Amino acid sequence: VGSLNCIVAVSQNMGIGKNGDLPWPPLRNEFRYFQRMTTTSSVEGKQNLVIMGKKTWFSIPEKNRPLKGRINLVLSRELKEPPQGAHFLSRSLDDALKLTEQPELANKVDMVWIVGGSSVYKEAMNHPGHLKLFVTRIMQDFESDTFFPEIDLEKYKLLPEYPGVLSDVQEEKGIKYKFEVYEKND
Ligand SMILES: NC(=O)C1=CN([C@@H]2O[C@H](COP(=O)(O)OP(=O)(O)OC[C@H]3O[C@@H](n4cnc5c(N)ncnc54)[C@H](OP(=O)(O)O)[C@@H]3O)[C@@H](O)[C@H]2O)C=CC1
Numbered sequence: 001v002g003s004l005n006c007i008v009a010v011s012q013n014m015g016i017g018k019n020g021d022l023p024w025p026p027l028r029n030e031f032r033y034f035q036r037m038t039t040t041s042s043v044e045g046k047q048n049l050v051i052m053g054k055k056t057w058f059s060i061p062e063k064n065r066p067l068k069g070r071i072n073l074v075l076s077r078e079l080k081e082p083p084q085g086a087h088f089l090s091r092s093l094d095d096a097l098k099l100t101e102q103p104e105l106a107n108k109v110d111m112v113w114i115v116g117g118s119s120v121y122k123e124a125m126n127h128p129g130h131l132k133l134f135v136t137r138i139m140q141d142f143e144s145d146t147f148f149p150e151i152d153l154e155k156y157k158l159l160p161e162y163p164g165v166l167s168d169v170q171e172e173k174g175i176k177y178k179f180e181v182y183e184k185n186d
């Protein structure tokens with residue numbers, strides 16, 4: 001089992017969601033970036049695993065779940081089995097990562113991608129170990145009701161560029177954004 005990563009798009013006032021949808025209008029190429037980063041496996045014979053909370057799962061249009069070409073794991077303590085379409089269910093992030101070293105998943109999974117929401121990000125970000133954050137900065141303020149936790153730059157180093165990630169400013173629907181990669185190892 002390979003690297004641990006969080007991926008998120010965030011507005012200037014730290015928002016990541018409003019009523020289970022994105023705060024901004026759909027950015028087609030940003031969704032393509034999310035799909036490409038989470039799906040592309042460095043190791044053949046394996047898929048990457050995407051981990052998400054319950055509200056993030058249900059925020060993906062039914063036609064699109066599970067996220068294709070990735071193993072989909074949902075976090076919940078209320079649910080008693082994976083939702084329709086999902087592959088795995090765990091009670092907690094630490095349980096999910098533990099499942100990842102069990103018989104079944106250990107030889108199937110390449111990279112692990114935490115794709116939201118807010119409490120899952122917070123926990124990952126504050127847990128010791130090697131972790132990267134792939135952060136799309138949407139360069140405007142958008143009304144939101146769920147936010148991405150503070151990035152502690154004492155621990156998370158912004159990388160000066162990363163392979164496969166454009167470094168320059170992007171714009172779609174009149175909204176400028178840029179892609180960043182942060183790395184901690186503690
Ligand atoms: N990158 C972006 O811009 C992203 C945006 N989104 C958006 O953000 C918002 C949805 O997210 P948010 O409100 O943060 O909630 P999250 O998806 O975490 O979902 C929370 C639910 O999942 C369960 N859960 C979360 N963490 C854990 C854990 N460690 N263990 C077990 N269960 C857990 C809880 O279910 P239970 O109560 O059953 O225990 C909780 O009700 C939406 O608006 C969506 O559009 C989501 C991801 C990324």
Ligand SMILES: CC(C)c1ccc(N(C)c2cnc3nc(N)nc(N)c3c2)cc1
Binds near residue numbers: 034061115
């Ligand atoms: C239809 C699929 C591709 C879809 C629909 C909604 C969402 N969400 C909540 C979402 C949407 N865009 C996102 N972009 C980045 N950079 N990171 C994320 N974690 C991210 C998450 C994700 C995928």
